[PDB]
From a paper:
To provide mechanistic rationale for the fluorescent enhancement of Glu-490 upon rhPSMA binding, we solved the crystal structure of the rhPSMA/Glu-490 complex and refined it to the 1.73 Å resolution limit. The active-site-bound Glu-490 was fitted into well-defined interpretable Fo-Fc electron density peaks in the final stages of the refinement. Positioning of the Lys-Urea-Glu motif is virtually indistinguishable from rhPSMA/urea ligand complexes reported previously. The FMR moiety consists of a distal N-substituted tetrahydroquinoline donor group, a thiophene ring spacer and a nitrile acceptor group. In our structure, the three subgroups adopt a near-planar configuration that is sustained via intermolecular interactions with [name] residues. That spatial arrangement prevents the intramolecular twisting motion of the subgroups relative to each other and such rigidity is critical for efficient fluorescence emission upon FMR photoexcitation. The nitrile group is inserted into a deep pocket delineated the main chains of G206–F209 and the Y700 side chain. Furthermore, the FMR ring system is propped against the [name] surface delineated by residues N698–G702 of the “glutarate sensor”.
[name] ([name]) is a type II transmembrane glycoprotein specifically overexpressed in most PCa with limited expression in normal tissue. It is regarded as a high-value biomarker for PCa and has received worldwide attention for PCa diagnosis and treatment. Fluorescent molecular rotors (FMRs) are a family of fluorophores sensitive to local microenvironment (e.g., polarity and viscosity). In this study, we aimed at the design of activatable probes by linking a benzonitrile fluorescent rotor to the Lys-Urea-Glu scaffold, a well-established [name]-targeting moiety used clinically for PCa imaging and radiotherapy.
Author numbering:
A (entry chain A), B (entry chain A): 55 to 653, 656 to 750
Write the structure that this text describes.
Amino acid sequence: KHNMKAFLDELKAENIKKFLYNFTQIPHLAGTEQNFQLAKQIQSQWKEFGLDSVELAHYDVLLSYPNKTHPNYISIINEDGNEIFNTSLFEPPPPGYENVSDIVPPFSAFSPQGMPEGDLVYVNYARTEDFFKLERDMKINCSGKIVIARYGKVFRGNKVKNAQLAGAKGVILYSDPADYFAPGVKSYPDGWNLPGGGVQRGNILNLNGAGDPLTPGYPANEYAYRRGIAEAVGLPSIPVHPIGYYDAQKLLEKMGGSAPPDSSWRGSLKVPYNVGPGFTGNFSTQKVKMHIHSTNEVTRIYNVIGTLRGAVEPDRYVILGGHRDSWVFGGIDPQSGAAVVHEIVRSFGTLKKEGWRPRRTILFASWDAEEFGLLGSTEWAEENSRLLQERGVAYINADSSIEGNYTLRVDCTPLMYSLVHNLTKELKSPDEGFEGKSLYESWTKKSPSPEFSGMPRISKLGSGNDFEVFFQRLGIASGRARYTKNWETNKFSGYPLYHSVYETYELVEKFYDPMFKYHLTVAQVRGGMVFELANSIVLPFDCRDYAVVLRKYADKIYSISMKHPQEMKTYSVSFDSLFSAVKNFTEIASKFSERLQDFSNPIVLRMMNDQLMFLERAFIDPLGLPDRPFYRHVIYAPSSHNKYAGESFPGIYDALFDIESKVDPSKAWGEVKRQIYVAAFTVQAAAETLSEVA
Amino acid sequence: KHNMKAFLDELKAENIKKFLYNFTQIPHLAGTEQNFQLAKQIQSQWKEFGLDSVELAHYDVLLSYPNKTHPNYISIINEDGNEIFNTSLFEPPPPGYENVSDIVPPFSAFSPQGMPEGDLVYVNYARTEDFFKLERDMKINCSGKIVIARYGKVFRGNKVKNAQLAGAKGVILYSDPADYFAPGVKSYPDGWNLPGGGVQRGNILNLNGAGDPLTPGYPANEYAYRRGIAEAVGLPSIPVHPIGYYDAQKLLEKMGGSAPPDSSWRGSLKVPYNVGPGFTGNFSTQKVKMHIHSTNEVTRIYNVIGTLRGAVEPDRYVILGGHRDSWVFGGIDPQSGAAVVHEIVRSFGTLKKEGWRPRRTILFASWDAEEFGLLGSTEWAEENSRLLQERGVAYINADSSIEGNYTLRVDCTPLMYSLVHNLTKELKSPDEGFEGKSLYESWTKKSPSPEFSGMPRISKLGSGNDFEVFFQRLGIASGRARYTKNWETNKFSGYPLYHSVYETYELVEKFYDPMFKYHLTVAQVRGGMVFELANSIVLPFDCRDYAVVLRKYADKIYSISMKHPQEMKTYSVSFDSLFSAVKNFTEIASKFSERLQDFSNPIVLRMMNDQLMFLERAFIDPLGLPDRPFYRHVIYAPSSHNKYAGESFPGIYDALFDIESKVDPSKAWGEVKRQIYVAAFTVQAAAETLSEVA
Ligand SMILES: *[C@@H]1O[C@H](CO)[C@@H](O[C@@H]2O[C@H](CO)[C@@H](O[C@@H]3O[C@H](CO[C@H]4O[C@H](CO)[C@@H](O)[C@H](O)[C@@H]4O)[C@@H](O)[C@H](O[C@H]4O[C@H](CO)[C@@H](O)[C@H](O)[C@@H]4O)[C@@H]3O)[C@H](O)[C@H]2NC(C)=O)[C@H](O)[C@H]1NC(C)=O
Ligand SMILES: *[C@@H]1O[C@H](CO)[C@@H](O[C@@H]2O[C@H](CO)[C@@H](O[C@@H]3O[C@H](CO[C@H]4O[C@H](CO)[C@@H](O)[C@H](O)[C@@H]4O)[C@@H](O)[C@H](O[C@H]4O[C@H](CO)[C@@H](O)[C@H](O)[C@@H]4O)[C@@H]3O)[C@H](O)[C@H]2NC(C)=O)[C@H](O)[C@H]1NC(C)=O
Ligand SMILES: *[C@@H]1O[C@H](CO[C@@H]2O[C@@H](C)[C@@H](O)[C@@H](O)[C@@H]2O)[C@@H](O[C@@H]2O[C@H](CO)[C@@H](O[C@@H]3O[C@H](CO)[C@@H](O)[C@H](O)[C@@H]3O)[C@H](O)[C@H]2NC(C)=O)[C@H](O)[C@H]1NC(C)=O
Ligand SMILES: *[C@@H]1O[C@H](CO[C@@H]2O[C@@H](C)[C@@H](O)[C@@H](O)[C@@H]2O)[C@@H](O[C@@H]2O[C@H](CO)[C@@H](O[C@@H]3O[C@H](CO)[C@@H](O)[C@H](O)[C@@H]3O)[C@H](O)[C@H]2NC(C)=O)[C@H](O)[C@H]1NC(C)=O
Ligand SMILES: COC(=O)CCN1CCCc2cc(-c3ccc(/C=C(\C#N)C(=O)NCCCC[C@H](NC(=O)N[C@@H](CCC(=O)O)C(=O)O)C(=O)O)s3)ccc21
Ligand SMILES: COC(=O)CCN1CCCc2cc(-c3ccc(/C=C(\C#N)C(=O)NCCCC[C@H](NC(=O)N[C@@H](CCC(=O)O)C(=O)O)C(=O)O)s3)ccc21
Ligand SMILES: *[C@@H]1O[C@H](CO)[C@@H](O[C@@H]2O[C@H](CO)[C@@H](O[C@@H]3O[C@H](CO)[C@@H](O)[C@H](O)[C@@H]3O)[C@H](O)[C@H]2NC(C)=O)[C@H](O)[C@H]1NC(C)=O
Ligand SMILES: *[C@@H]1O[C@H](CO)[C@@H](O[C@@H]2O[C@H](CO)[C@@H](O[C@@H]3O[C@H](CO)[C@@H](O)[C@H](O)[C@@H]3O)[C@H](O)[C@H]2NC(C)=O)[C@H](O)[C@H]1NC(C)=O
Ligand SMILES: *[C@@H]1O[C@H](CO)[C@@H](O[C@@H]2O[C@H](CO)[C@@H](O[C@@H]3O[C@H](CO)[C@@H](O)[C@H](O)[C@@H]3O)[C@H](O)[C@H]2NC(C)=O)[C@H](O)[C@H]1NC(C)=O
Ligand SMILES: *[C@@H]1O[C@H](CO)[C@@H](O[C@@H]2O[C@H](CO)[C@@H](O[C@@H]3O[C@H](CO)[C@@H](O)[C@H](O)[C@@H]3O)[C@H](O)[C@H]2NC(C)=O)[C@H](O)[C@H]1NC(C)=O
Ligand SMILES: *[C@@H]1O[C@H](CO)[C@@H](O[C@@H]2O[C@H](CO)[C@@H](O)[C@H](O)[C@H]2NC(C)=O)[C@H](O)[C@H]1NC(C)=O
Ligand SMILES: *[C@@H]1O[C@H](CO)[C@@H](O[C@@H]2O[C@H](CO)[C@@H](O)[C@H](O)[C@H]2NC(C)=O)[C@H](O)[C@H]1NC(C)=O
Ligand SMILES: *[C@@H]1O[C@H](CO)[C@@H](O)[C@H](O)[C@H]1NC(C)=O
Ligand SMILES: *[C@@H]1O[C@H](CO)[C@@H](O)[C@H](O)[C@H]1NC(C)=O
Ligand SMILES: *[C@@H]1O[C@H](CO)[C@@H](O)[C@H](O)[C@H]1NC(C)=O
Ligand SMILES: *[C@@H]1O[C@H](CO)[C@@H](O)[C@H](O)[C@H]1NC(C)=O
Ligand SMILES: [Ca+2]
Ligand SMILES: [Ca+2]
Ligand SMILES: [Cl-]
Ligand SMILES: [Cl-]
Ligand code: NA
Ligand code: NA
Ligand code: NA
Ligand code: NA
Ligand SMILES: [Zn+2]
Ligand SMILES: [Zn+2]
Ligand SMILES: [Zn+2]
Ligand SMILES: [Zn+2]
């Protein structure tokens, strides 16, 4: 029989391992010839595997590269202008890769050029609250200072935006062992920790969903009109560069001025973590100087798009997508994901060769330039936005399959919760101690839901990956899944070797997943979701699960506002309309679910499959959120303080944030009330898409 | 049999006449008790007629009314401040209505209050080109002047916006006999001409699609957050008032300063039409003073929404809508339309009582507050926008059924051209001399297409009526049809008694349509279109007709740009991408049409009906046109110089308009190129919705 079990049994750990090895021998930086060569290889293999069509979709987008003959670095300079300390020009390459060429040195993509010199201020993680603490409580002024911030806790683009708004003239990012060195594990190559010469690459844009900085709204095709650089979306205005902790120690050790305000500001290095500004007495005349010479350049990128045409509803698309470009070798990010997609394609293609087709069309995507701002997925969705919003059933992302070896991690729309619970109950746990038990059982035991006993934790989608255009701009039901760590060590930093030259095939094979069993489990979860989405007669979405979370989010946002009881009285701020809408959604969703159970009529079916498919769509507001026109989903947006985190009822959340500091409270509370109305209206409108249609 | 012929034969001229009489005995001003009473009557009768559900949908919107105890008027004042001439306080009521109460006196809805005094400037029709002529050629400065403009040629809101941007401190509108008195016909009540005491009411907003000025984007429901008045959409900033030609003659006769620049500036009154400023020598110390005391007030309005549930595709909506509110009695506008809708509902309901249902759902709408800015249709579409954009097949408007008795007028999307040709070939001409001939034949003979022999003229949709939200904001295929005049007399002014107290039942019964045969023909055209849209197995849209017009519009816009060959060379302005997209659309549309002919499979059918339904939808750009976020259709928008007229490729048109006067040509031509890219991209994206789906 050709059923989900046939699909799942065809997936092989050994194949994933072979593909990962194949994808990680050389760097595949976006816009480079090697990444175009890999794109062509994937296109050819997906054709071989049996897909109906496999095309490259190319765009010309703004990318950023260091200057090969004018290297980026940072110095401590003395009063004569002699550079007495220089940060490294490259990470020491790992064993056996010391002759690999075209390893891009560490840099912050899209940094402007410049050579600013000044006194250092240490700003902890450079979060909104770190700058609050500096300016409001400690009275330290960052204006015209170079700030030094540790990576972790929030997306590095938000750190840079925060530093810029504080008046910094430059930003130095570094990896503190507190955040990137797990106690009792060795540094690469003898364990999975970050060595002191290791450095995390990454872009520092604030795109807010825009895609290519030069063509917001429209695909960067051959005849596109581009903005000039001065009007580009999301570029930083001050130079930025990342360093490892050997070099950071040299920059931090001489720091003077004020003490750290508390122990939450101290990392693990043998330094005081003084905030500054500037160095202690002996060295007070020394300064820090950055030298940044990277250039932004419009460069061609290539997505591979594979199609497996649906037998019954070819005009309904279930999308499995993940990126292919990497900073260096991409051992985890993204090739551990891409190897998993390759094996999924292979398995579906085996079934297709035996005569099977899925009910709905499955689209497979190998995205380019994800690392430079989700550019390949966003440009392709801008090109195809009309097809996607009228036909897009679901998008399953497929970046890194592992960031640990402890348990499953799922972030998705509430519409997929029941699908994920059901599927994981049918899959075998790969975990030691759970032999013969379901993935659901092991996952639930290791990662319990905070709300419900006997259920596992499933998080809201945030951002910083290729589902952003599909979910928060276009309103297509989206999900992601990977193996993860126990979050009770170095929390809200990912894995230590993230975006470093040390993220290699050997990292994975030796330290994360030697048997490729976690990879296989992740292929079963991602592939299984795609299979059910593309093949179930009734779409496997439960609208009642949206009703339950909407109430939780409404309680949360109400609780935030209720910290200001006097202002809620003065300005007549009521949440009644939002609770009413959520109550109505709950009642209508319950009734819709009864009809979905209680209806041989393919029009009623497809009518109801359309109501299911368009339910995520109904949370889109075509006017977008304030000053973020590409974040249109009213229930979920990336946190305005951390692109990685999701925020619920983001319009109301941002209206309430730090509201006690606004100069005009009547105007600020007016805007809170405006966002309440928008959210209540959108919830009610979404509910009404589930009512009887006539 | 229950087929279109059964539907059409059930329609009766005598019923339309009875309904028109019933709807026009008292005024039905939006927001008044009498208009709520009529709404309740229509709701009750549509239920009686057999519709499945009939609901009122109410909103609280900004309306505008004169102050009953502080009347609006204009004076000529002398140097002592004695008011030596006053304009009328009311139109002399027609025979037999001299005791009807609650006739709203003439006023310009949404005028601010004020009592400005100053010298008059006569500005012809107050068009963009009239102000160009004044400022650029004649060197007359309107700053701080009261302008007097004749009605006609363009929507009165554009006149006011143009006067405001010229620095006027007030606007006086009047009806010139040149534009509102047809040679050789008598004034009401003895003919259909405007008497000298007659005055045209009408709002002077510039909403650009926004709907209620206080709630752009969202329905004005019970919990809506409203903008303050200062941030409202579209309100004029200077007082405005309309007068008849007896009073205008008194204001114009003393005008001095410069002569009219040419005869296109002279109307029919026995006055010089001097432009001013101010009066001739003897009277140079006299001034004009306005007294405006109207108030804007949030007021409840009521739409009636009737549903006839579809038998096979209940989740597909074909909408017949027209408004019910009137300025006074609404003898033509809108009750000649509403009586026609009432009879259509009656006929469909007769068939329903015999057991028939249409294939798709038909929604019937009696809109409120159309006269105050399309408010009722727009608020309802804002409320239901998600249902309408995923389910809306078509919208047929149904305002005034007659504006003349000469021939048919149709303005619609190209997607309806073939439907209209086919239907009119099956209908009988009501015209004298065409007994036994088709409506198509009489219409084609009297109103030939300018492009094609043996075809009738069908115009682009403009605006100034309730289809605006459905077509230009939401991208639902839309059309309108009515009987019209021969446009070779007083051109681009409508009918003489438009928006006057004289627009009565007797006007229609005595002078326009004594046998109600033109009304019946219009009921057959509107009703027949609805019938085919709601009942044809394959949607009756021909995508090839869009391809033909796209080429015509691309040639037109290219020809405008080619007036500036030097700048097109300097700035590398090419239309190649737009022509390529139009060529592709033509090829893909031809192939789609072959498949539509060449496919028992209801999924392929409905898949292809979805491609047809979503084709108009594909011309929407969710970012809207520049500074007009609610005009989202890239092919059609209301002219930025005249809301009544449609403009094709409006983004490029506005970028090219008066471009030779821009101070920064590189920036201006850059924006032309940007709009070319947007238009070429949107045409190609629309074409690709017609490609094979996978
Ligand atoms: C959750 O779902 C419920 C439906 O079960 C919605 O309930 C509606 O709530 C609104 C209030 O926001 C009600 O609005 C009121 O309507 C009255 C007229 O209603 C009649 O006509 C409608 C046709 O639209 C019928 O549906 C209805 O059954 C009645 O026949 C108005 O008279 C009310 O206005 C008066 O009172 C208010 C409040 O004091 C004053 O401000 C006004 O000035 C005026 O005096 C009022 O507008 C509506 O009737 C309810 N519908 C139903 C079917 O019960 C909730 O709105 C929904 N939640 C959200 C967030 O949408
Ligand atoms: C009307 O419809 C036609 C399709 O019939 C479209 O034609 C496309 O036109 C674009 C130009 O805008 C072509 O783009 C060119 O693609 C080359 C690579 O194409 C290969 O890969 C694609 C996969 O996407 C295949 O479809 C294709 O068959 C080929 O296998 C590039 O190499 C070209 O770039 C080079 O030349 C340009 C121009 O000189 C330089 O600026 C570049 O720097 C570079 O050197 C170029 O990008 C595209 O190939 C065409 N497709 C097909 C199938 O023919 C029209 O675009 C469409 N009109 C509109 C408005 O959309
Ligand atoms: C830190 O690095 C700086 C800069 O060095 C340069 O850039 C780096 C990224 C590497 O690619 C280096 O190889 C590269 O040189 C060092 O300061 C520089 O020192 C050099 C050599 O001593 C100076 O060159 C001199 O140039 C003048 C020309 O007028 C001659 O008089 C001299 O004979 C000599 O050739 C150079 O001027 C100087 N540059 C700057 C910007 O200060 C620095 O020594 C190094 N510090 C360390 C390792 O502690
Ligand atoms: C044009 O109309 C103005 C204003 O008249 C008023 O408003 C109109 C819309 C109508 O509703 C009128 O019925 C209404 O009166 C006329 O000017 C006004 O004339 C009256 C009567 O002569 C003046 O009243 C005077 O008030 C003072 C109070 O201090 C006394 O000294 C007088 O005994 C007398 O009662 C009024 O002040 C004056 N108003 C203004 C604003 O000028 C005007 O006569 C008329 N012109 C015509 C018909 O040619
Ligand atoms: C209900 O739910 C809840 O309770 C919500 C809970 N909740 C609410 C409150 C606190 C909170 C915090 C977080 C996080 C904070 C830090 C996080 C992780 C990192 C940091 N700093 C990090 O760098 N990880 C590396 C892998 C991830 C990026 C990685 N992606 C990329 O590398 N992409 C590129 C390009 C991206 C782009 O340009 O946009 C890049 O980032 O450079 C991946 O996705 O694997 S996640 C998440 C949820 C959360
Ligand atoms: C291919 O095509 C082509 O060739 C396109 C050709 N083409 C291109 C170039 C020249 C041109 C000019 C025109 C016109 C110019 C003036 C016109 C008519 C009037 C004036 N002035 C007028 O007042 N008519 C009264 C009835 C119409 C309004 C009447 N509507 C209302 O009364 N509505 C209210 C509220 C509206 C709102 O608030 O928005 C109001 O207007 O007050 C109706 O629709 O019956 S139409 C049309 C097309 C055209
Ligand atoms: C990753 O795996 C791919 C797919 O197996 C490898 O690419 C493939 O490499 C082989 C051997 O080089 C190619 O076959 C050769 O073809 C040429 C003619 O073009 C011929 O001269 C040789 O004799 C040989 O038959 C094959 O085309 C190619 N397939 C692709 C790109 O689809 C790739 O080498 C692996 N990469 C690494 C780093 O291991
Ligand atoms: C995840 O799995 C659960 C458990 O199987 C699914 O819920 C179950 O769905 C079935 C099929 O629709 C329900 O069966 C129905 O039962 C009623 C009788 O009460 C009958 O009227 C229907 O004809 C039908 O037989 C079943 O009740 C229901 N079980 C529970 C506990 O809710 C669920 O649908 C799955 N989720 C997804 C997204 O697939
Ligand atoms: C326009 O036509 C409508 C519909 O025919 C007229 O309204 C209807 O008027 C009649 C007579 O007044 C109403 O019947 C009456 O009902 C009351 C009880 O409510 C009773 O006291 C009387 O004896 C009589 O039976 C009828 O309800 C009403 N129908 C509606 C509103 O649906 C209306 O009068 C006409 N208007 C004009 C201006 O001619
Ligand atoms: C308006 O009326 C015209 C004329 O009736 C309609 O065009 C006609 O549509 C029919 C039905 O699809 C076409 O018949 C087809 O003919 C081909 C053979 O060439 C065959 O392959 C198909 O199975 C089918 O029998 C017919 O060719 C076509 N006539 C013309 C002159 O184009 C048109 O569809 C109507 N428009 C609307 C919107 O309904
Ligand atoms: C990368 O840096 C080098 C310099 O280290 C740049 O080459 C110089 O560019 C300047 C300014 O245009 C010229 O005046 C010199 O003649 C060049 N010098 C040398 C030594 O080649 C180069 O332009 C930069 N590359 C990029 C892509 O920006
Ligand atoms: C319409 O106009 C009348 C005046 O002709 C207004 O009534 C006056 O309002 C003023 C200012 O608020 C009061 O001081 C007076 O006591 C009122 N005078 C009279 C004679 O009644 C009235 O407010 C206006 N109506 C509206 C709805 O604006
Ligand atoms: C910080 O320093 C700058 C530059 O000297 C100054 O202009 C600014 O006002 C200061 N801000 C605060 C909050 O002290
Ligand atoms: C793999 O699992 C073991 C057992 O818990 C753990 O000690 C080790 O740290 C894990 N490896 C990684 C990379 O997390
Ligand atoms: C018109 O008059 C005003 C007011 O006196 C003046 O400020 C303005 O500059 C003048 N404009 C032109 C174009 O002459
Ligand atoms: C009705 O038609 C006749 C015949 O052409 C014409 O003379 C008369 O003016 C028409 N009435 C109206 C209101 O146009
Ligand atoms: Ca873009
Ligand atoms: Ca509104
Ligand atoms: Cl992922
Ligand atoms: Cl109409
Ligand atoms: Na384990
Ligand atoms: Na290695
Ligand atoms: Na005639
Ligand atoms: Na009359
Ligand atoms: Zn990644
Ligand atoms: Zn990454
Ligand atoms: Zn009207
Ligand atoms: Zn009107």
